[PDB]
Amino acid sequence: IASASCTTXICTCSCSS
């Protein structure tokens, strides 16, 4: 349900580094 860069179907994923 939350995270950055890491799922396929809700909406986060990745986005820095």
Query: CA-CA-CA-CA torsion for 16, 8, 12, 15, nearest 10 degrees?
Result: 10
* Specified resolution (Å): 1.9
9/17 Cα distance (integer angstroms): 22
| Cβ proximity of 1 and 12 under 8 Å | no
Method: electron diffraction
Region label for 2, one of left (φ > 0), alpha (ψ between -120 and 50) or beta (otherwise): beta
| Cβ proximity of 11 and 2 under 8 Å | no
14/4 Cα distance (integer angstroms): 5
| Cβ proximity of 14 and 4 under 8 Å | yes
Supply 3's token pair.
């995270």
Which amino acid makes up residue 16? S
